[PDB]
């Protein structure tokens, strides 16, 4: 459960933690967070993190030091930081925090953020250039690609689980397979 | 008349606009100056989500008014 670990550092309030914590052991969630208030409040804790689309360096040094990727080689750490993106979009989604036709804005950006610091640490994990073109212009609405994040997080397990199995299976919540 | 429109993590892109303007047209200068198409646009002032088929008049809303955008991207 490398996933409840990495919520436990990033997320200070523990009402807010324990919504993110809860949500590993179901597949749907029936509390959203697409209202104003709601994504004022994820701002609110993730802004410190993002720079725009991206994390903020401080964010990367800090994460790239965590219990998780600390010691990994690139690859590894590329593999690791590709499922947090995965976990992220999911949260986004229709069957987490998002709805339909809405999703957490926040929470886009820092799977976003993820996604694009694993292309940074080793390439090779998305296979293919335009794969990972497709996947950023799906979490940002970029060239009218579909937004639907449900939709997304499918393309990402499906890589995950076939291209490095064991860190998919080891970092993937397991209620969400 | 200028506003502003802030999005959730502190940009401020700023427009120049009638209170006569529809909110269909201010989504559309928004996407002018940043590629946003209009549909991707959540536009709120004072709380309240800013309707298309109304205008800035109709929401009292004056010159150099900030309003909030946030991206309405599909779960």
């Given at each position: 459960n490398?996933?409840?670990?990495?919520?436990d550092?990033?997320?200070?309030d523990?009402?807010?933690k324990?919504?993110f914590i809860?949500?590993?052991?179901?597949?749907?969630?029936?509390?959203?967070?697409?209202?104003?208030?709601?994504?004022?409040?994820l701002?609110?804790?993730?802004?410190?993190?993002?720079?725009?689309?991206?994390?903020?360096?401080?964010?990367?040094?800090?994460?790239?030091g965590?219990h998780?990727l600390?010691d990994?080689?690139?690859?590894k750490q590329?593999?690791?930081?590709?499922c947090?993106?995965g976990?992220?979009?999911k949260?986004?989604?229709?069957?987490?925090?998002?709805t339909?036709?809405?999703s957490?804005?926040?929470?886009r950006?820092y799977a976003?953020?993820?996604?694009?610091?694993?292309?940074?640490?080793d390439?090779?994990?998305?296979?293919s250039?335009?794969?990972?073109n497709?996947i950023?212009?799906?979490l940002?609405?970029?060239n009218?690609?579909?937004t639907?994040t449900?939709?997304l997080?499918?393309?990402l397990?499906?890589?995950?689980?076939?291209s490095f199995?064991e860190?998919?299976?080891?970092?993937?919540?397991?209620?969400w397979? | 008349?200028?506003?502003?429109?802030?999005?959730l993590?502190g940009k401020?892109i700023?427009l120049?606009?009638?209170p006569?303007?529809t909110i269909?047209?201010?989504?559309?200068?928004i996407?002018?100056?940043?590629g946003?198409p209009?549909d991707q646009?959540?536009?709120?002032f004072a709380?309240?989500q800013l309707?298309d088929?109304?205008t800035?008049?109709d929401?009292?809303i004056?010159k150099?008014?900030?309003?909030?955008l946030?991206?309405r991207?599909?779960?």
């Open positions: 490398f996933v409840s670990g990495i919520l550092i990033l997320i200070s523990n009402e807010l324990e919504r809860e949500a590993l052991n179901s597949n749907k969630s029936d509390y959203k967070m697409i209202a104003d208030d709601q994504q004022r409040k701002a609110c804790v993730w802004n410190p993190f993002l720079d725009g689309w991206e994390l903020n360096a401080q964010h990367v040094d800090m994460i790239m965590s998780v600390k990994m080689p690139l690859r590329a593999e690791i930081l590709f947090l993106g976990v992220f979009c949260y986004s989604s229709s069957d987490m925090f998002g339909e036709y809405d957490p804005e926040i929470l950006r976003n953020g993820l996604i694009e610091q694993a292309y940074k640490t390439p090779q994990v998305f296979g250039v335009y794969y990972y497709d950023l212009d799906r940002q609405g970029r009218n690609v579909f639907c449900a939709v997080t499918d393309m397990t499906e890589h995950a689980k076939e199995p860190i998919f299976s080891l970092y993937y919540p397991v209620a397979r | 008349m200028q506003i502003f429109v802030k999005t993590t401020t700023t120049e606009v009638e006569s303007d269909e047209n201010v989504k559309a200068k996407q002018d100056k940043e946003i209009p646009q959540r536009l709120i709380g309240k309707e088929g109304r800035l008049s929401y009292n004056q150099e008014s900030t309003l909030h946030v991206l991207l599909r779960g």
